[PDB]
């Protein structure tokens, strides 16, 4: 879980300040469409010399074995990044890329920055990829990790991550025709099929205010409009 004590690892690019540094990433795991990254550092977070804590870390510096509170030692990808949970050799944090993770002290010895290029995994959901959770409505499948403080790695777990939306589709039901006035701010996959007594296998990519007319039998249609899961009507308005 948080067994044994931290160690150093070779930083691929560091200053002349250090190189044999702490906080030198081994792996990062993604597939998140949230802004979180699961990080495996040489240094152990969630463990100080006192054993298990929730907001303290420990590190072998290659010069000293010491622990601190997370403050002076900040993770960044340009700007600071705030961790969420610690599981020993693994960190789970909010810090969106994870592709490169740069951990540096701008308080602790010299001006240290280690930047690490290391393993990542990321995947489309099957509509559009995103890594921003706003507060805009509907969510889509994503990956996240557990917040284990006890049983080393935080296991992968499915989760729901908010996706960017855009001005909602003006649906107009009409006679045998349902026109979908769409107004994306962001590329949306419009996948449709009619419902009721018809069904259309129709993918189209949309972006910018457009109209897309579809047949309907008087029995609606489903339209999935990217960054949303199915939005469907079965109206007799159709």
């Amino acid at each position: 879980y948080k067994l044994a004590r931290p160690y150093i690892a070779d930083c691929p690019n560091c200053g002349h300040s250090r190189c044999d540094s702490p906080i030198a990433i081994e792996e990062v795991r993604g597939d998140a469409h949230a802004g979180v990254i699961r990080i495996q550092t040489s240094a152990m977070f969630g463990l100080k010399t006192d054993g298990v804590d929730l907001a303290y870390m420990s590190f072998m510096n290659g010069k000293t074995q010491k622990s601190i509170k997370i403050d002076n030692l900040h993770v960044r990808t340009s700007a600071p990044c705030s961790l969420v949970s610690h599981h020993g050799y693994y960190i789970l944090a909010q810090c969106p890329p994870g592709d490169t993770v740069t951990v540096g002290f701008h308080d602790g010895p010299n001006r240290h920055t280690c930047t690490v290029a290391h393993k990542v995994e990321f995947r489309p959901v099957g509509r559009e990829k995103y890594r921003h959770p706003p507060e805009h409505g509907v969510e889509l499948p994503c990956n996240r990790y557990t917040h284990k403080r006890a049983d080393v790695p935080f296991v992968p777990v499915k989760a729901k991550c908010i996706a960017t939306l855009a001005p909602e589709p003006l649906v107009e039901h009409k006679h045998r025709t349902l026109i979908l006035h769409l107004h994306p701010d962001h590329p949306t996959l419009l996948t449709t099929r009619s419902l009721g007594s018809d069904a259309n296998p129709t993918r189209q990519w949309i972006e910018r205010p457009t109209t897309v007319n579809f047949t309907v039998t008087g029995e609606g249609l489903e339209y999935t409009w990217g960054n949303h899961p199915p939005k469907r009507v079965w109206a007799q308005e159709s």
Binding site: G126, H175, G196, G218, E219
Partner: protein, 381 residues
Amino acid sequence: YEHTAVMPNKVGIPYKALVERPGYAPVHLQIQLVNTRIIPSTNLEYITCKYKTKVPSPVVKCCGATQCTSKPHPDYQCQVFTGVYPFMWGGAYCFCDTENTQMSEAYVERSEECSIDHAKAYKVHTGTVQAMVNITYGSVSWRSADVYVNGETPAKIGDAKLIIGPLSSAWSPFDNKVVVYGHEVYNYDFPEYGTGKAGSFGDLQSRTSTSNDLYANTNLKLQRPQAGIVHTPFTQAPSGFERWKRDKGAPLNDVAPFGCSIALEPLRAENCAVGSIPISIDIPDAAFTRISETPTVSDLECKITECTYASDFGGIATVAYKSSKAGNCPIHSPSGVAVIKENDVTLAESGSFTFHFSTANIHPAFKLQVCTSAVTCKGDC
């Protein structure tokens, strides 16, 4: 009384049908397909997913050869490179400049996230189809009854004895080979288990991928170590699963050709929505009064009080009539582009019943039948 009606494969709109036999007491009949699940047997062929390359540390023999052979565990490939590093040059300063040998090994595994962020290659064998057919008989509006569509057994449920003559997805919109990504489902055909593919789906294969016991093709191609450094270089063709993510159709769930909400993993087609569904409904004679009321409905007229252009249920119309005896009439539209909202009509001696209807026509024109008399309505709107 058996009444066989044809319901649009539609969810949410109850489809009105008549148990009609005037001079008894016709029975209110509404059938709603709440859900249809085509559930086929899924035989998992293999997991395939985004690999993570694992490179073991290279076995270097200074002043001796290093031997390795190909191994079938994932797409493990090694290559023996001889005379790799001279003396006073190379990544190791080996005394022997020609007997220094590096074996460069690497292989692919599944990603840690593969378990939930992995795809599943499925063979599809014959299923069962359940259909949740809500058949109402008697002046209510709901019952909801499970019934086998596939040839198994007739629904001997008390809500009405249902035989569902083949649904408009009495088989799922599935091929024999289906990819489930566990997010979105695609009908996609791939090679049978035993051989992977590099730069297309099935880059890792294994009945269940564990990280080993896989048969893969990722086209791992060892390169000779660059001089002056210890390194284990390799090239590879595109990750074939990832290539498939970059070269797959529209999410079949969202474009299904039968209007089915195709759902993952145990593949099944939920809530199909194309065509119309034969429904055989046993509404017993017991749900009519046996010639003790006589619905003989005569002098019937339809006046539409209001109607709205092609609407959900914007139709308001009234049927004035004379009946010999009071009763209960199913007021229906045998269409699927029109249903009557009501499905009861209060027969009385000088009875008048205002019913709400739906049509999808420009001017809502629906045929209503009560017990004995039927009309088609047009009027004030």
